[PDB]
Amino acid sequence: HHMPKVEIAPSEIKIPDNVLKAKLGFGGAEEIPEEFRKTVNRAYEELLDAAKPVVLWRDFEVDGSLSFDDMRLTGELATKHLSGSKIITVFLATLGKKVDEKIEEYFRKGEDLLAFFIDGIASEMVEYALRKVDAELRMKRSNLEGSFRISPGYGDLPLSLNKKIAEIFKEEVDVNVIEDSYVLVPRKTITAFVGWR
Numbered sequence: 001h002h003m004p005k006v007e008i009a010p011s012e013i014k015i016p017d018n019v020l021k022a023k024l025g026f027g028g029a030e031e032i033p034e035e036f037r038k039t040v041n042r043a044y045e046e047l048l049d050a051a052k053p054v055v056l057w058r059d060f061e062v063d064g065s066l067s068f069d070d071m072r073l074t075g076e077l078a079t080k081h082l083s084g085s086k087i088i089t090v091f092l093a094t095l096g097k098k099v100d101e102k103i104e105e106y107f108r109k110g111e112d113l114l115a116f117f118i119d120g121i122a123s124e125m126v127e128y129a130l131r132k133v134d135a136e137l138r139m140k141r142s143n144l145e146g147s148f149r150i151s152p153g154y155g156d157l158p159l160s161l162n163k164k165i166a167e168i169f170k171e172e173v174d175v176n177v178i179e180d181s182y183v184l185v186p187r188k189t190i191t192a193f194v195g196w197r
Helices: 017-023 034-050 076-082 097-108 112-140 161-169
Strands: 005-007 054-061 087-094 189-196
Touching: 017 112, 034 097, 034 112, 054 112, 054 161, 076 189, 087 112, 087 161, 097 112, 112 189, 161 189
Parallel strands: none
Antiparallel strands: 005 054, 054 087, 087 189
């Protein structure tokens, strides 16, 4: 069972200013207002201290079919992007449980705005961690065409798949879906598929 993983230093994850700015309520603003500069700085500084970005993946040889290790991709979105492909990669990206604990710590102290900045930078940090690796795999694999990246719960793709993917990486990383609504723990954890023609 070949389960590669990369650990990425939080400061090496470049989130574009306008994506950040939009995520924290300053969509379009040319700059983040001076009144929130020190706060956002601390949110981002706190996040850098607590986050432990890890992205893991696994390649399956499938040739055309949309079923493999214990799962079967069902919706119409799946077919559009993933059908007729030789390999399908499943990704898991996470920032770890200390991120969750820091968010809760600030809600508990009643610093809800700070916790909001942190939660939002964190949502984008785990996305761009995944994108960083998605891109490396694209650049390496010249002999192939990578599909669009799709996550469980987007369109017709069952959210229930989170549970299947969690199981795949259970031994490589601290992750569960302890909730029967298929919600991943730790909370800043994200899943995706990419197809390769």
